[PDB]
Every structure is written in structure tokens, then in C-alpha cells.
Amino acid sequence: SQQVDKIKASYPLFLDQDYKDMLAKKRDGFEEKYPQDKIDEVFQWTTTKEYQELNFQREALTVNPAKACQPLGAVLCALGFEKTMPYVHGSQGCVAYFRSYFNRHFREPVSCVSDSMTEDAAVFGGQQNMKDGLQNCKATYKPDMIAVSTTCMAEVIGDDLNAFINNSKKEGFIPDEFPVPFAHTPSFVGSHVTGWDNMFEGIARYFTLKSMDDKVVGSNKKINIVPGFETYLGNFRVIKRMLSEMGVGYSLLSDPEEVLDTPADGQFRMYAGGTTQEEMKDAPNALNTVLLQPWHLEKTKKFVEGTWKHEVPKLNIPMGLDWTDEFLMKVSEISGQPIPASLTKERGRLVDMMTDSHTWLHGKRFALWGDPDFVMGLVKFLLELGCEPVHILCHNGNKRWKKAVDAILAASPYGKNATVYIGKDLWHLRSLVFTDKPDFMIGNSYGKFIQRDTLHKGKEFEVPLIRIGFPIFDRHHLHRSTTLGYEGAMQILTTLVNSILERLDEETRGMQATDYNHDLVR
Amino acid sequence: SQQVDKIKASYPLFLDQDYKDMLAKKRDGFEEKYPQDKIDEVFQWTTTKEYQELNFQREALTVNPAKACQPLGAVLCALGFEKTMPYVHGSQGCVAYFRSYFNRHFREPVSCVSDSMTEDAAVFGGQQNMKDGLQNCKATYKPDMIAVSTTCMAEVIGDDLNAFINNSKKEGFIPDEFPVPFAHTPSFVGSHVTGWDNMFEGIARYFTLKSMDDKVVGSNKKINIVPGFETYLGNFRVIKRMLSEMGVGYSLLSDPEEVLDTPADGQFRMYAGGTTQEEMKDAPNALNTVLLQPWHLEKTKKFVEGTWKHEVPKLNIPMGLDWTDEFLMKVSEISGQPIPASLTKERGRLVDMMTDSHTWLHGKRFALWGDPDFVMGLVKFLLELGCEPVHILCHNGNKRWKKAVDAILAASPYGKNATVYIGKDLWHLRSLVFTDKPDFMIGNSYGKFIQRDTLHKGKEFEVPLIRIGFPIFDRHHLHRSTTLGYEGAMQILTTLVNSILERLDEETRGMQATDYNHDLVR
Amino acid sequence: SREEVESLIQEVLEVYPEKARKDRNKHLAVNDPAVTQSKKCIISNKKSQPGLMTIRGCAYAGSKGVVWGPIKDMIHISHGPVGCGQYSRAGRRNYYIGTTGVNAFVTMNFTSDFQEKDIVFGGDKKLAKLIDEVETLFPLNKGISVQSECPIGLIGDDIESVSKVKGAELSKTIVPVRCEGFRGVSQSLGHHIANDAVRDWVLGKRDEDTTFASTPYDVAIIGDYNIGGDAWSSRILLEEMGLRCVAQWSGDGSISEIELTPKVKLNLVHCYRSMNYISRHMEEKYGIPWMEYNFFGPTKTIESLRAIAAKFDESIQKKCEEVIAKYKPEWEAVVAKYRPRLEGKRVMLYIGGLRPRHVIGAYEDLGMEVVGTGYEFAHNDDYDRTMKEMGDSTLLYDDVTGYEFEEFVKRIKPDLIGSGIKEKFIFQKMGIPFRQMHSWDYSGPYHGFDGFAIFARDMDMTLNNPCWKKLQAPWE
């Protein structure tokens, strides 16, 4: 039933007595469902130390992973260049998924094509699909550039991207000077951050490999910035703002900030802004190249050190105070510009915030996950705050990264109770937050399922989710946030101390029971 | 008892059984406390329509007001001027409170003096305190300027600030040229916003009244901006950023953003930034003067229209989409500068956010309160979002303003269920949220006790507090936010839609009851 | 108009190379409600032209995302690299009642997460080991499906063998599904491979069993995936009408309901496209008749209730007329409130395989007109059903391209578009009101009388929203 003045959607509609009664009959009659008694006992068992031991013996099964595959990163990379169409050579199912995935995170259109390789293209190869596809795409959507990556099936069968594209050009499907950079992006290797590294390297090699002869390092007086797989619009914007503020000439290579934030003004723009082809061609002339997220830009770094001959600085991701400081001094060192009074003041305003909030953050325990550089940046900042990371999970992490993060942890009194996990998923993490309960989780939307689980055990075991990372599908416009630099650090500090205060108020909102500590002033 | 490894503060310590027992004995033995039965019965009665009728018949009793008194606004005004010491002539109890109130909201030092009028100065006048105080203040704290306001007692006994200051100067306690503007700020008239209007008009009168002879309107080619009582740092900044973006020469009169956000770098800066004495002297040469919060800058408006002869534009507070637009076009008409592409795009990004979040914002019902201009800005935006204001309260509001807002409400389908209240307090609003339950409250920290009350009645009756306004004492660093312009509207849009999604997740987090609607993607 | 629309078709097609032009021309038509053989006017279910930004998915999405995934008390393994399973995790809102991770698993992502060694050496050993860990960590699971991603089908892993061997060792139904993404041309073949697997590995488990107590009023709901609770909202009407719903395929579905479906008297098929396969098979093997119904809006629902009740005795027909009389004042008030706000409005639709024709009824009940519609992957028998439901000189498109759909809308200028998440943000930026017609924009149900109320409210809230008048800056 519906009262026309107050229509109910699925919640709370299905709580009406007639639906509830109907669902009771469904279950009893046809579901052959395990008794509630058993379900509760099984549930309780999965929260124990013994279930954790079994759970951590897994060797073949993955449950709720915290990563996606390579071409997702390639697509994001390709999106960052002017009038560029991401083009994924292989099965079209993948593209439908990549677009949907980014649509939901960005609440924006996401442009990308497939060349629709079917069963006969599986056994004969995708040479024809690549010919017809490059021609059709150029004609219909008119990009300046098409950036080609691969699905897993094109990789199993070894479709030679370089040859397929050269024959397309040789046979007149697209003009020879029409730029078609490529990168093999196999999904069964690494993860989506690895796909970003691979795609960027293809494009950079495409524009600079032939013509190294006339390049002189330092001759355009600018600093190359490579951001890596990045999904906070504010992150592109803050790097650009701090460099402009210092007077540093800079060149952001892969810049999707504009095209992922177009205005609603009556027209759809498939393309907007981004790194130009001329900027890439000119990149080897820069003073140096800074990699924002080095732990997934290793292939890019070898090409840039080897072919461009830049002394790429050893910098951590510029998150939190020390590493933002370190980033700014090194940009200062490369370019000759001193650090302006305006950035120095901003630094002291983040310090002021740390001093103001330290009593509430101190000793607070967090479980967290995400991509390698993000996680280590977030871990470093939690330590600078007097917080205790407890469970650090990075599913797409490696042994060397794990070694670096264990060193940061051990350098501080606040890391004594923390352990780093690589190769482990969100079902592992779920066990950890039941057996060794932290105060909060910091991760993406997928963590809401953990929070629901911890709550089902009991309100005193509930571990709230703090949404920082990618993808965030169940809040709106968090993709406009910042995590880098001083600006990112202020936002994170504010998100953290206020999650802490929001939770405390909930635990103290009980009339004449807990509200003696329901303070007006915190 | 305490575990040395996991120490408990007041919460949850006193939930230990021995404290619980000790409290049970205290009550029973010595409190002569009404039986729980009666307490529950009176409580239920305070949630009904009949109590509301009694509650709304009040004529003499005020409960939980939503305003402060004039000198607080006067102090905030003076703080916004270069090296200026706010000076409140009267009782020192007032000053200890003013600083505290601002300390807790801004989490910054707040400098202001009293001249400590005691019982004998009550009966003999505050002439002597004023002589010694100005001399002592000037010598010890060395401001460039001293801005004198009054406590309620100095107003009752008619202490003539003008006379007392001149006799201070004639007798050499402070130098004759040393700037000492003043304003009578009685706490039994209007409130803290009226105090700001009074202070600003006194300072402006001080620097420009004698010398109107040599002023020509429009000759410095700048637009004067008067912010009014504003407690979001970001609001001063967004106005400064948008004018600069347009190339409009501007002069912001009363600018405390710097002094309220000094860096923690090893030294205390009693003063920083602010409107210079030269800016004030030069103000009448500006093209025109824009008042950001007209509904409490009426005294200022008469002085500037009467004496400076600026044709002050008829502008609403620039909040939400229409009135930000309206503000930008008027600044464009006055200065001659076009509206730049970067602002046009900023507008389309706010529109884009509104199209993206509209299905969740639609039909949501809000109770809200705060200052006159803030409230109406907030009401106008909710209507632009498709939301339904229901209870609009403004305790320090007046009958004309009430009419202005009822007209705005009537201009939209979404205002048909709203009522505006002036003169009514937070104990009145509490009845309103029990008898005609909205989905959320938008207000300041004082609202957390209302939420505590609605929850004690029942989880289905709980009305969550969304903290936007002044003062905010129970979250950290919200005073860095923005509420004006496109940037302000984006922050407000994001807070509202995510408060809605956060609450829905809470209502659907129940394992095997409501979590069928605990969706990953919202 | 008929000629004007034909002209619009020829102009749009001018941008394509000749091969893509000759083909895309076959998939765009000007409707004739008189035509009953759609082959004559349009062709469908062909492979997409490379590089043209089709909105189509793959066989795996069709099988795992759509048919299998909703079955709540089985564990569905995304077999292969980590991407597929991760982009589809809780993306489709197939609602279910259960204790997730204990006795129910719908929102969870199970995968074998192929690395390079698993590609080169094959993954049958890992798959076997994977099933042991599952049975350890989720002992209340009542069966397991193995959903092959692209590379499982290339390298020739023997998942049937692993399923027979491990299933015997554990006395557990394990269903191997070859829903390799490169198979077919879209989601459609995945439905089919999903239905044949249900048939081959589950539907027959109780062929010899006669313990279940059957009545002449037993029916199954086939082809409702309970989006936002659509199926729960349908089920209630059928039962108030005195029918007993033994099964729901596959929204809120259990493996036991599927095994008990052969005991019903009539199969109620909502989504024809995705489950007409198993319905024909159940008629051939068990003698069970099946019929298509539509519970979108009052007119279609009322007509469907009467048609279904006519398959039984007069008692059920009596109860039919009761249910109708009960909800009559409720759907009439919805009409009185929302139709005046929607009358005369024009909508263009583009969805998968059922809704582009199925929901036309609900729109008309609010006085709206469907001026254009098309499918991602229908077959010609869907377009046979479609053309009488559309008006004359309306536009029909199949596997429409991003470009084509963009340009059609520019000319036709509808007031509302109802399509998917990939379409959404394109058209909002154009100032055109947009409703998601897969996910229902996280709202719904829209099925039945209770859904229609949410349906009316959603179409009006969006189309008449104050945000749509704000797209142009006053100064330009």
C-alpha cells in the first residue's frame, strides 16, 4: 500500500506488515534456509581468532579484493591528454565496466571505445578489428589522438599492437602522422596502478624516442610532473597551485582534471583540457621530472632516467608535513625559486591545526587500505598526528614497498602495534578488525560491508568507516577533495578529528545514561 | 578502577559497576528525585501539541536563545582592522566571556581589553578608567588603533564615550592624533549583528566625516566591500578570490581573516593583516560600496548613502546560485569588468553538482536557524535544490525581514509548508521538531541538545543536527569553511547530500532486516 | 514526420566510413505499428562495429551479473583475472534477504584472481584448491558456480572436470559456466549459457523426489531480478490473488526454489529475453505452460492480473477482481496528483532487452509519450513485440552508438531520457532530465501498484526539478 501524500521507496516500504508476512512465508516454504540458531553461531565463529587463522591460510581463493586490473589505469592515463580517446583493444565487456566504474566515482561522462573482438577475433587475431576500429573512431568521435591499451584476452593470444597499428596506417585506415601510442596492459599482472605506469610510458616513448638528438636537458626551464593514478580532482589542482605560487615553470603530464569536471551549461563536451602533444614532445627539455607516486611509476622512471637523462629525485608522495616539505625543498632546489611566504604560512596553519586537535587524535587506532603510495602517505601522516595505525593493508603492494613502510613504522613510537599486509584482501581485513579492534577504518566504499558486519556482532564492536580512497560510490562529490600537500593534510586532519567527535557524540547521546559527557565544548 | 594499558576518561569510566552503584545510592538516598515514571510522563508531555501551545504563549521567559549581544559583534568588527585593539569600556566580566566565546569557535587567541569598571565607576562614571585604560592599553600592547565599544552597564549610566575620550586626549593620556573611534553598543538592543553595524559605522564615521570636501566618487576605481558579522574564514577569502579573478579593484573593510588564522611557527602575533587606516580614509573615493549582509548593515548603509554618496546596490547576501549570479553581474556593471570564463565555468560545475545530487535532495524537510542574512541565504538555496524548508527560525530577526523571507518562500512550490519565526528561541524550535518532524536540523552547536531530546523519544523520531552557523564548538576547524558564492554553495550542497546518505546508511545497516537497501552505489 | 525522421537517419549516418554506414543503417528504423515481422524493418543481435562506443557488455555480465549473481545462497566464483568480478561487485541492485557472508553472498566478490603463472600453467589446480578454501570458510553455502572470464576459455582449462570431481568429493552442487566475455556479441548469449547451465546442473536434482506438497495454484516468477525490490512488490499481488509463488528467478532466489520450480502449474515470465530458454525447456520436459506478463503501471498490471487469473478456476478470478478493487483508489490518486504534471511530455528510452517496450505502459498512464526507444541487445522477437507498442513514425534503434544517440536527441529534443549510468551525465550536461532505467537511480521498486507510486514520483521530481532552469548563466 501507498499513501499518495507520503510515498515509501524500498526502504521503508518492505517493513510494512503485509510484506514482512509475505517474506516470512517465502523463507519458510521454499527457501530451505538454515535455522537462525545456526546462522548466528556461524556468524559468531567468523569473528573469532580461529576463523582468522584459517582465513589467513588461504592460497587460492580471493574474497572482496582491494584492486582492479591494468587497463582501468591505462584509460585514466589516456584521459589526461588533449582531445584523446582511450581505445581498448580486446573484448567490449571490459570497456562497459571501465566506464561504469569511473562514472560512478566521478559522476561524470567517461569516454572510451573498444574494438569489439568476438570469438572469431579470438582465434584469428584482432588485426581487422584494429583497422576498422581506428578508422571508425577517428571518423565518428574525431579525437586528436587515440591511446591504445589491451584487455586480458588480447594479451593471452599475443596480439602485436605495434604491428596491428602500423599495418592500419600502411593500408590507409588512418593517416600516418595521426598519433597512436600504445601499451600492453595485461590484467593478470600487477593491478590498475600498473596499467597507468604502462600507458604513460607508451605515450612518453611515442613522443620522445626518435628525436632525442636535438634535446638539451634544462633548456625549457620547466619541471615535469607525473601524477600517476590519481582520483581526487583537488590533487591535480593543488600541485598546480603550489608550483604557480612559487613561480615554478611546470608541465603536468597526463592532466584529466578538466575533462572529468566539465560544466553543465547546455552542452556535452567529450574532450576538455589536458596535457598537449607539444608538451610531451618538449618534456625531455625540462630541468628534471618529478614522480608524485613513485611506487607505481617504476617503468616510467627507467625510461625518463635512461632516455631523457633526468636525475629523477627520490621523493615520497607529497602527503603530510615532512613529505610536502621535502617535495617543496626539492622543487626549490631544481628550479632556483625560494619558497614563498604564502606556502610557509600555510605550512604553519596546518601545524596550528595539528596542535589544536592533538588531544583527540592521540593514540587513536586505525585499520586502512588503498594503493601503495596513498597508503604510505596516509600512514606517515597518521604517525605525525600521534595516531596508531594498526592494520595496514595493500592488496596490490610488493615486498620492497612493504619493507619501506615497515621502516617508517619502526622509526616512530606510534608504529609499535602496526603490521603491514601485502597480497591480502578485505575479507582478511574483516577478520583483523574483529580480533584486534581499531577505532576506525580508512578505506573506500567497499568497507561499508565490514562496518555492517562489525555492527551485527554488537554496537560496542562497530568500527566506523572513514571514506578516503577509490572508489567512493555511496557519498557525493568526495572526488573534489584533496589529499596532497598542506591542503590535503588539512582536509584529512579535519575528516579524522571530526569522525572521532561524531562517533563520541553518538556514544554520549543517551538521555540520563551517557549524556553526562555530551559536551557543548570539544 | 583503571587499567594502566587502557585508561578510561569520564566516558566510559563511570559506566563501571561500582560508579554505577555509587550513583544509584546517591540518587535514592539524597536527591529526593521524581520517580522515573513521572519523569517519562512529563517528557512525553513536552513533545506534544498541547505543550507547544503553552510554549508559544510565552511573553517573559526566554529559553536557549539563538543570539548574543552587541559588544561581541563590535569586538569582531574591530579585530578586522590593522593593528587594532578592541576596547570595551565597562565591566571586565564581559570581555573574559567575549574572548572565550571566540577562542572556542575559532580555536585561536583573541585579543581585547576591558577598562574594568567597578562599583565606584558605576556610580562616579567611567571617565577615569577611560583615561588610564587607553594610556595603559596603548603603552603595553601598542596597537596602531583603539576601537572603543561598551558593556550594558556603561550604557545604562550614560557614559559619554565621545567626551571621555576627548578629555583623555586633552589631558595627554593618549596623543591627540592617535585614532580612537567609538560606538555605543547596548546589549539590550538588537544583538551581536547590530553591534557590528554600530562598530563599523563608528570607525567609518571617524576616518571620513570631517574631510568629505576633497572626495570624489569613483576616483580610486575600486569597489568597497563590507562583510558584516561573518565567522567563516573561507567567506572573506572567496569574495577576495572572485573579485581578483574578475580584475576588479576592491577594498574589503573590516578583514579579520589573517588575525584569526595566524600560523603556529614559534611566535605569537597579536596582530596580523586587516583593513588599513588609509583604506578607510580613501573609501569614499570608491566607485560604490557593497554590503554583503544588508539585513544587519542598515545603519552603515544610511551613513554611506548619506555622507559618502554611494548608490549602494540593492543586493541579497550572495549565497546559492541566483544571488551569487546577481552579485557577480552587479560587480560587473559597476567596475566595467566582464565576468571571466573561469567564474562562468565555476557556476556550471555547481549546476552540475545540483543535477547530480537532486534525486536525494528532493523533498527533504529542514528546520533551521541562525542570523538574518545567513538564514535567508540558506532558505533561498534549499529552494534552488528542491528541498522543503519547514521551520525557519531567526531569533534576532525583525518584522520586515520576516516579510522578505515569506515572499521568497511563496515564490517557490517548495516553500508551501514553511513557517518563519522571529523572536522565538531554541526551546520553541524543539517543540516544532517534535510536533512537525523534519528530516534534519541545520543550525549551530546549541542544536545538539535538541537532537539528544528527539532521540530520547525514539530512534524513529531523532532529528539529526547538521552544523552550519555560529557558534560551532563541538567540531574542529569548521570555521575554515565557506558559505558564500559558488564555492560556498558546493560545500553546502555536499554537506547536505552526504548528511542525507550518511543517515540512510545508518537506517539500513541492520543485518537481515534493513540492509537489503544498504547499497554500495548511491 | 515519417519522412523527416528517415532524413534524420540518413544525415547521422553520413559521418561513418562506408562499412560501418551500411551496417548501422540496418539497425535504425521508423516504426510501423502495422508491421508484425520486424525482420522486414530492422535487424538485431549482430556484432558491434569496432570503435563506435556501443553501450553493450559481455557474456559474463549476462551470466554472472544477471542470471547467476542474484541467487543468494550460492557462491559465485569470478574465475580469472581480478577486474571483471570487481567492476560488477554490488553494481546491480538485485535485492535479497539474508545474513551476508554467512548464509547469503550476493554483495560479495569471490575470485581466483589470476596471476601470470596461472595463465601459463593453467588454473585447474588453483580452482580445486579454491573450492576447498570456500567450503572451509563459508560452510553454510548451499552450492558454488564458477563463472569463467575471458582467459579461462582461451587456454582451455577443464572446469567441468574440476566441478564433477570436487562436487562428488564434497556432495555439493558446483556449476561450471563458460560465460567467456568474447563469446557472443553481448549480454544476451550469457543469458543463454546461464540458462543451459541451470538446466544441466541444477534443475533436475529433484526429478525423482515427490515429497514437495503441490497445489493447483503453484506458480513461478521467471525473469525478475528484484531490482530495488521489484519482485517482492510483484509477488505480493500474485499471492493476494490467491496464487502461491514457489520460485523467483533469480532475484532474492534460493537454490532450493530453483529445484522446486518443476513442480509448478504455470511459469510467469517477466523478462522474456533472459529466460525464455529455460521456460521453453520446462514446457518440453515437464509439461509446464508459460506466459509473458507486464507489471509496469496500472493498465498493464490490471490486464496481466486478469490474464493470469484466467488460467485458473473462478475462485482465483474472484480474488483478481478483489485485488484490483483494493488498489484502484491508490493508483487513481497517484494519477490525479502526478499526471497533470507530466501530461504531454516526450521521453526517449534506451535499455537492455526488456524494459524498452515493457515500461511504455507506465509512461502512458501518466500521459507521457515514448517518441524513441531501442535496445542494447534484443533479438528480432523482442522487436516483434515492440512495434505495436510504439506509435507511428517513432524512432527505433539497436545497439545505438554514443554518437547516434547524442545526435538523435539533439534533433528530437525529448523532455526526458531513460537509459543507463554511461548515458546519464552526458545528457544532464545538455540540460535534459534523465532517469536511470536499469538501477532506477537507486530508487524503486517500479513493478506493480506500489511501485507505480514511486515511479510517478521519480519521473515528476526529475523532469520538473528547479535545477533544469539553471543551465544558462544570466549574462551568457
Place this chain on the structure above:
Amino acid sequence: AMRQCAIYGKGGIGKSTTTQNLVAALAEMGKKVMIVGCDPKADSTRLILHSKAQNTIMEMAAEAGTVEDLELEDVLKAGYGGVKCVESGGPEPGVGCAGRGVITAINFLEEEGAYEDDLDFVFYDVLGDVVCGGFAMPIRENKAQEIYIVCSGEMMAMYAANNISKGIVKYANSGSVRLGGLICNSRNTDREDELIIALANKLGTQMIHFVPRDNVVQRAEIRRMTVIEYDPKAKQADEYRALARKVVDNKLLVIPNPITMD
């Protein structure tokens, strides 16, 4: 400076034998040579390394977890004459995907810089039936630039040379990869050398050398050695030196023209 060559030919024709005997002579001439085996049975370096070279690339990756964890030191060994050997590895018959194993191994060698010591020649030994893209990995751009096709006078061997040449064309047109010649590994058929010269002519290439059938080759193979190492004075041993000298001096690199069977 560096020359990369890929050896193709009909299954069972003598590629791995011919390749290894050539490289032996090449090393004996003072060349720095690497052999890259691209066959799941991993027999391509078995005669340069006596008895064992236990460690294939895929094997070590499977054991080590991932290819990225694997260091160059683990899979590349030196045998007779300082000849460097590495094997792709792959699955046993009938399971997994040997093609992808080749892609991964060749990609590993590139990423780890295996090509940049001071090498004169790189030889890729590929299996007979080239069933997929993986097994053309050695003839992509920046891999082998010279291809030699092993054949003989019988109908089937020549038919195969022609079909491998068609598979080459797409890699030859779009790249720099070129056919170097046909090497005739005799089966003692009538007027066989003339016959292979004729075939070479129709393709657009030459027959670089006629290698006689001599059972010392198999006798040395049974000893896990090249003829060069097993018996340096034998007639067959001088044959591989002649073949070796000619490959050093070859300048003929063509795009072949495949014929229609008539």
C-alpha cells in the same frame, strides 16, 4: 653492433640442433652469443650446457611467485664457449598456455636489460607449429631482425617454409624484421640443394647453406653436446663452421613473396 636472429621451420626439421651447432661454431669464432629458447619443452640450450640448465624462466617465476620478483641471475647461464643460455619454459603438454609463457619471458629479458652486455648475436629458437601471437614474440619490432627458415627437399618441409613466410609478412611490412635465408638440413633427397635454391628464389631469398645428413649429429645429441664440441675434426663440424661464417657475412635481408601452390 648487436644482431638478433630467429630460427623457424617445420616441426621436427632440426631447428634446435642446427641453431645450437651454429652458435657453437660462432662462439668458437670468438663471437658473444645468447640463445633464447622459445619452446615449452625447453631443449634449445640443452647441447650448449651439458646435462642440465634446470631453470626455465616460467618455472622460476611460478616458484618465486611472480616474474617481477625474479632476478636475471636465476635464469641465465653460460655453457660451451661462454654462450649464454636462457629458456622460456612453459607447461607440460595439454594444459595452460605456452604462448603467453614466451611473451612473458621475452618481456622479462627486455625489462632486465639482458640484451645489453656486449653481445654480437641473439638467437631465438622457436617451435615448429606457430599457433599463436605468443610464438611470434621473437620477431616483433626491436626483437629479431633476421629470420632463417630451416627446410629440406620433402614436400611438407617446403610447404611449411612458405606458410611461416606468410606469417612473417605482417611483421615484415610494419617493421624491420627480414628473412635472411633458407637453411637446408638434408634428408638425402634427389637433387635437393638445387630444389631448395629454386624455392628460395621464388620467395625472394637465398639458400645460405646445404647441411648434409650425418649421424654424428644425433650421436653428439645423445651425449648432450654439439658436434663442434663432441668432434671438432669431423666433416659435419666443418659444415657448421661454413654455415657460421656465412651467417656472419650475410647481407641479404628480404620481405619474402609467398607463392600459390601451383
